[PDB]
Symmetry: C3
Subunit: 234 residues, 3 copies
Amino acid sequence: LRAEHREKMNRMRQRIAQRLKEAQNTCAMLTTFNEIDMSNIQDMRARHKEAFLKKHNLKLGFMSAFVKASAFALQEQPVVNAVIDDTTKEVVYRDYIDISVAVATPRGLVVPVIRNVETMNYADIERTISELGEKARKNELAIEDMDGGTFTISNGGVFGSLFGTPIINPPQSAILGMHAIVDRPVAVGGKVEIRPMMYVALTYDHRLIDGREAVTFLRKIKAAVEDPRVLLLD
Amino acid sequence: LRAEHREKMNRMRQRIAQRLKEAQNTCAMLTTFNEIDMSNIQDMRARHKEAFLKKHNLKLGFMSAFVKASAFALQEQPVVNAVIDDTTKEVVYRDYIDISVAVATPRGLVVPVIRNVETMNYADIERTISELGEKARKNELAIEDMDGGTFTISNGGVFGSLFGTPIINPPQSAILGMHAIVDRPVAVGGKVEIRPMMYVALTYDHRLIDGREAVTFLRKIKAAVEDPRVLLLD
Amino acid sequence: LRAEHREKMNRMRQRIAQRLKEAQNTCAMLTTFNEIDMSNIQDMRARHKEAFLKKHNLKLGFMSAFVKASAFALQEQPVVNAVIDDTTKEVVYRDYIDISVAVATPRGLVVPVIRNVETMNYADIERTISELGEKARKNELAIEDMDGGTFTISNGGVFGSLFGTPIINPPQSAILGMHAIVDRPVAVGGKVEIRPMMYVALTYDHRLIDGREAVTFLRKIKAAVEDPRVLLLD
């Protein structure tokens, strides 16, 4: 039996598909990959998760380690923070860092913005994600705090993808895509151990960001997650 | 010696290159990857290949395991089966499953269609591929059975590519790309074994399919090839 | 404090971003990957690097092994050497091989051309890269020897990227992207050894090059780097 039926799409879905194709026809997107060893983050979460809950009443997750390491890399290379506006053919630098965090709730995808990430620590980031996660869950999430982001983390790794290519939020110039954590054999010190590792991806605008600047950017995020004490040093 | 000569391209190759660029300018294509362990398929082919040839006069291959697992995943998530027609800005659902199989013969690529995959088993799929493989080999393959497919398998793995990005057949919304089988060290149960594994890819339309629905789709194909008894269960 | 300031981009950067978007809107780019074992190249550099420096006054690097293996693969499949000109809708074959080498100096990226690679050896290629590397370093590099290339090597592996997708130099049809060398566990002979391996990528025009011809091309480059004695044989 061969049955097909035409259901229509509303005017809201019209604009979402319209903005999506404008993001590809504007900027020349490329993608680069790397690989992060997640051993120093898990034992940080293994021994300090109990004193964190008693003192702050929050959960200690992986997400706050990637947001704080992203604000560290952006303030070192400001060209990734930049945006090309094709109205006056201008290059708009910024001096503030607002990282948008895609948190997929039951309803669907929402992309709220964490404001002024430069001065925070892990305790401040965890407050911001938790209470704003409750806002969008019961649908009280405003429009005015969903725009103006300068960089975007995309957790598509809570479902188990190995690696993949993300899509740029069109008022920005780059996006980081984190993925699932698997145990794979690793050659460390000339021996074959098993360590939990993650593939990461970075989709960047090649009109603005150089091919070597995107590699150095993603290599700097790796150093601040394989060893989070670099945030206190250089 | 610097010699170059202009040979022309015919009007048939004109349209093939024309349809190819229309597939990129219409839909916003992204790609996601995963990894399948092919151990339960090979020992199925190791002990039952002799009773299969005596009783059916056919060869037992890898291809029929991917076609039957693809019809299983499509009937669970019908949104991958859908197509956006931009004539009336409509979303066309379908209730039938027709998987197109790219079988590269000596002449070149051909993409015939297997009709009504929902009711078949491995024995029915193997008859359909084998006799239709003989039709396109001696060039009696009609035009009327090359169109109307809803999903596409692309075996580019008979040449030995590791992984790569396929291209969407433009009346469809997704495509699966299987690749070569290599023996790689695998961390299973806390120990380092060697098991034959395959990388797979899924190129999807981001106008229609969500970013989390493409990950769940490819994760469901993996469960029906790492353990083919799920086709009898849920 | 929220400060942003508009700095302009000059008319040279206007055209670079203009040519970049024309390369995507012309040709349908896809990407395929593979993996090369770099053991036979390093012990060639381990024992012959001293007699090479005494006799030629040059350094023995990895780059000359990829340029000579690329001219070997291009003269076997001339369709990768071809270019589609959309002025008269023509397919322009060539009989000469000019490989462009992107050598990122302190100033930035430059892409000079090595002319007539068919007759050279490793000693001739190393002379051409070394003295022309000194020209672009002190900025005496002419314009007339930066155009007319037919194939492009892109070393983005001196910074440590795992793998990624390159961009086609628009008068060409393909580009090879080499990457960083890491020690990873390898299943060889049924045992788990540790060997230095590299991921490589090939971005090709799907209007002209078939999907199976790009896989066979990159598989042929692998055979001439895993065993460089094939250059004397077939």
